[PDB]
């Protein structure tokens, strides 16, 4: 386990990579459920870098219909919704350390538009240490991003039966390499992956959750296959046994056709993230960045796409990483059988 002293040293490293120095102001955003050891380490480390530091504490926002403790489960209103003063309190900072998980939401976008940069840090200290961000991780993700920006389409195949086509061009490519060095940029310690969105009403085919694939926020390894049939950018069919029935029930609960929309699509570039990691944890340990970032995954998501100017505001959000996939940009392979093959400068 990580000592307090070590956790402060980790935050000094990551805040330095985030370009925090005596010219910079740092806001540590927190709520009653934020990890106090992480809040303290962030506040202390920023002071040690001679930054101007303050904490902003928001009362927790409850979604009555939300189930489970995972903050990614319910993307609706947040503690900032209608709270312009608190938003201005974050906009005043050069860098916000988010320890409460501001959903990508309209208010977070305006903060980023002022040139404030935002670093999410919510995973437990031991997970923060295993995937301590590096400039080399930035280099590899940005190399990958060069290909993604150039792509007119993304295609996924797998032996299990994935056969999925996403026309690209309408939406930007987004990177997460673990540190918030650029003004107006959001990132997540820990991370190391990239994604875009398909063009409106355009994603088509089949995505198969094989045995051993993951649904977040369920934080289960599939023991039975689930087939997702996609037409015009929407899931139209969810087929399998029990796990398929559980997924259909959960998605129906929200009573909104928007939950079936395909949102972000991309691949994982983090070799310190591990597909096996989730099964050594309890659900409430964190949001499982290991499952989202692991090297060579294909990661897709469902529901809201508001954050890049899409139509869909729906709260129901799933992140689904698939293993063993072939991933093409315009029929050049970036991943084959779950190993990163291109570009050469993105490989571990």
Give the SS3 label for residue 157: strand
Query: Between residue 287 and residue 326, which ones bind Fe ion under the rule CB under 5 A?
Result: 301, 319
Closest to a second copy by CB, 23 vs 150, is 23
Going by the DSSP 8-state scheme, the letter that residue 243 receives in this structure is H
Closest to a second copy by CB, 21 vs 253, is 253
**Torsion sign (Cα): 177, 91, 94, 31:** negative
Query: Between residue 194 and residue 213, which ones bind a second copy under the rule CB under 8 A?
Result: 211-212
Which two structure tokens, joined as six digits, stand for 129?
A: 């240490």
Are the beta carbons of 148 and 193 closer than 8 angstroms? no
3-state secondary structure string across 163-183: EEEEECCCCCCEEECCCCCCC
Q: How far is CA 21 from each of CA 51, 53, 127, 312, rounded to the nearest angstrom?
A: 5, 11, 25, 39
Closest to Fe ion by CB, 162 vs 301, is 301
Are the beta carbons of 306 and 313 closer than 8 angstroms? yes
In angstroms, give the least distance from the CB of 95 to Fe ion.
24
In angstroms, give the least distance from the CB of 1 to a second copy.
4
Question: Residue 348 binds which entry of Fe ion, a second copy, none, with Cβ cut-offs from 5 to 8 Å by kind?
Answer: none
Question: Residue 347 binds which entry of a second copy, Fe ion, none, with Cβ cut-offs from 5 to 8 Å by kind?
Answer: none
Beta bridge partners of 204: 165
Give the SS3 label for residue 48: helix
Pick from 16, 19, 31, 225: which binds a second copy (CB under 8 A)?
31
Pick from 13, 16, 44, 200: which binds a second copy (CB under 8 A)?
44
Pick from 161, 169, 184, 241: which binds a second copy (CB under 8 A)?
241
Q: Can you tell me which residue has the tokens 């085919």?
A: 205
Strand 318-322 versus strand 214-215 pairing type = unpaired
Distance (Å, rounded) from C-alpha 347 to C-alpha 144? Answer: 9
Closest to a second copy by CB, 40 vs 170, is 40
Interface stretch with a second copy, choices 69-77, 148-156, 195-203, 340-348 (CB under 8 A)? 69-77
Query: Between residue 74 and residue 133, which ones bind a second copy under the rule CB under 8 A?
Result: 82-86, 88-94, 126, 129-130, 132
x-marked contacts with a second copy along 162-201 as a string, rule CB under 8 A: ----------------------------------------
Closest to a second copy by CB, 68 vs 257, is 68
The rounded Cα 58 to chain-centroid distance in angstroms is: 22
Closest to Fe ion by CB, 99 vs 306, is 306
Give the SS3 label for residue 265: strand
In angstroms, give the least distance from the CB of 6 to a second copy.
6
Q: Does 105 bind Fe ion (CB under 5 A)?
A: no
| Phi/psi at 97 (5° precision) | -90, 110
Q: What number of chain residues touch Fe ion (CB under 5 A)?
A: 2
Contacts by residues 331-338 (CB-CB < 8 Å, ≥ 24 positions apart): 331/155, 332/147, 334/144, 334/147, 334/267, 335/267, 335/296, 335/298, 338/296, 338/297
In angstroms, give the least distance from the CB of 232 to a second copy.
27
Question: Residue 16 binds which entry of Fe ion, a second copy, none, with Cβ cut-offs from 5 to 8 Å by kind?
Answer: none
Binding residue numbers for Fe cation? 264, 317, 319
Residues forming the site for Fe ion (CB under 5 A): 301, 319
């Amino acid at each position: 386990p990580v000592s307090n002293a070590q956790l402060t040293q980790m935050f000094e490293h990551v805040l330095k990579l985030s370009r925090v120095d005596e010219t910079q102001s740092v806001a540590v955003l927190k709520s009653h459920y934020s990890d106090p050891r992480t809040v303290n380490a962030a506040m202390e480390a920023a002071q040690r870098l001679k930054a101007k530091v303050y904490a902003v504490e928001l009362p927790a926002f409850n979604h009555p219909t939300a189930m489970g403790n995972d903050m990614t489960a319910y993307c609706g209103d947040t503690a900032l919704t209608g709270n312009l003063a608190a938003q201005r309190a974050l906009e005043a900072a050069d860098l916000v350390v988010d320890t409460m998980m501001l959903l990508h939401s309209p208010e977070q976008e305006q903060i980023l538009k002022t040139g404030t940069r935002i670093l999410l840090a919510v995973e437990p200290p031991e997970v923060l240490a295993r995937m301590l961000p590096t400039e080399d991780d930035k280099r590899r993700v940005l190399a990958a991003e060069t290909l993604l920006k150039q792509a007119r389409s993304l295609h996924v195949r797998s032996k299990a039966g994935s056969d999925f086509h996403a026309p690209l061009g309408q939406y930007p490519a987004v990177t997460e390499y673990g540190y918030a060095d650029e003004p107006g940029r959001w990132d997540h310690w820990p991370s190391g992956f990239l994604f875009t969105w398909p063009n409106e009403d355009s994603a088509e085919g089949t995505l198969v959750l094989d045995v051993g694939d993951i649904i977040l926020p369920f934080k289960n390894y599939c023991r039975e296959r689930i087939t997702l049939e996609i037409e015009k950018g929407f899931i139209t069919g969810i087929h399998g046994g029990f796990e398929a029935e559980y997924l259909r029930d959960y998605m129906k609960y929200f009573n909104d056709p928007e939950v079936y929309g395909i949102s972000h699509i991309g691949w994982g570039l983090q070799p310190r993230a591990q597909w096996t990691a989730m099964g050594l944890h309890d659900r409430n340990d964190g949001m499982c960045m290991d499952a989202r970032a692991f090297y060579g995954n294909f990661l897709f998501s469902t529901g809201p796409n508001t954050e890049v100017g899409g139509k869909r505001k729906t709260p129901c959000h799933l992140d689904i990483p698939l293993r063993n996939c072939d991933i093409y940009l315009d029929d050049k392979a970036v991943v084959l059988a779950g190993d990163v093959v291109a570009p050469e400068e993105s490989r571990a």
